[PDB]
């Protein structure tokens, strides 16, 4: 997981089409809110070729990665979701913070030099991270590198969410089961700039200029609540 690139297969048209749709939009590609997109590529697979997207690896050259995946939206199903998955989708949405906050914990990795990374399962979302207060604490734990709280990194993450909110108010796209990914290298300085905050996983993105999506995603609602939590974390790290 330590190369320049992520070569992600195109298992459906939606992620590929979204990247192609915004590829000349400076609001998407010049703001640093999504991974850098290199293009769609065909690579040999089976009897023919398989379509891939090539994007930057956000953790390139990270020494001790810290990773936090936050799933955004008031629901994680869309009009194309298979019926066999629907009961589980409805339960997890309602018993996590998804329906209430539009954002929920979806996994964490912390490397504190303890000879093995500490993995926090995404299934913690319906039991241990099922409240706003518990979600705030786990994000605080993400900013804990094992020795201190990296309070200086928080303003970057709020700034990233601000740019995300600005583009999503235009409501040109609906996104389901997408995430905002928090990463940083604990060995970094503010000048090394080895930290990042990006939207990812657009496999269920709808292009509203080309198709209808009746249900709402609650994506802007989730982004605002996540920004509010980080602002609370900023105010609470002042006592350090
Ligand atoms: N550009 C990136 N650079 C580095 N890591 C990434 C990047 N995009 C995603 N990741 C990480 O790598 C793994 C990425 O998955 P993706 O977002 O690719 O999942 P999926 O394959 O679409 O599966 P699912 O829908 O079940 O989450 C995730 O766990 C995410 O943390
Ligand atoms: Mg995902
Ligand atoms: Mg996906």
Residue numbers in the entry: 31 to 270
What's written in the study?
However, the evolutionarily related ortholog IP6KA from Entamoeba histolytica (Eh) was sensitized to inhibition by FMP-201300 when its methionine gatekeeper was mutated to valine. The approach therefore appears transferable not only between the mammalian isozymes, but also to other IP6K orthologs. However, to date the mammalian IP6K isozymes have been recalcitrant in crystallization efforts. This limitation may, in part, be circumvented by focusing on EhIP6KA, which has been crystallized and structurally analyzed. An alignment of the AlphaFold structure model of IP6K1 and the crystal structure of EhIP6KA suggests significant structural conservation, especially within the active site. The fact that FMP-201300 recapitulates its gatekeeper mutant selectivity and allosteric binding mode against EhIP6KAM85V prompted us to attempt co-crystallization of this related kinase and the inhibitor. While the valine gatekeeper mutant of EhIP6KA was readily crystallized using the published conditions for the WT counterpart, soaking or co-crystallization with FMP-201300 remained unsuccessful. Remarkably, the structures of the WT and mutant EhIP6KA are virtually identical except for the additional space generated by the reduced gatekeeper size. This result illustrates a potential limitation of crystallography, as it can only provide a snapshot of a momentary protein conformation and may not be suited to unveil subtle dynamic changes that occur upon inhibitor binding. The fact that the inhibitor exhibits the same behavior against IP6K2 and EhIP6KA diminishes the likelihood of a distant allosteric site, since IP6K1 and IP6K2 only share 47% sequence identity, most of which lies within the catalytic region. After an InsP6-competitive mode of action had been ruled out, attempts to gain structural insights by crystallographic analysis of the ortholog EhIP6KA were undertaken.
Inositol hexakisphosphate kinases (IP6Ks) are emerging as relevant pharmacological targets because a multitude of disease-related phenotypes has been associated with their function. Genetic knockouts of the three mammalian inositol hexakisphosphate kinase (IP6K) isozymes – enzymes involved in PP-InsP biosynthesis – have revealed their involvement in distinct biological processes, including insulin signaling, apoptosis, cancer metastasis, and lifespan regulation in mice. Here, we implemented the analog-sensitive approach for IP6Ks to identify isozyme-selective inhibitors. While the exact structures of mammalian IP6Ks have remained elusive to date, those of other members of the InsP kinase family, for example Homo sapiens IPMK and Entamoeba histolytica IP6KA, have successfully been deciphered.
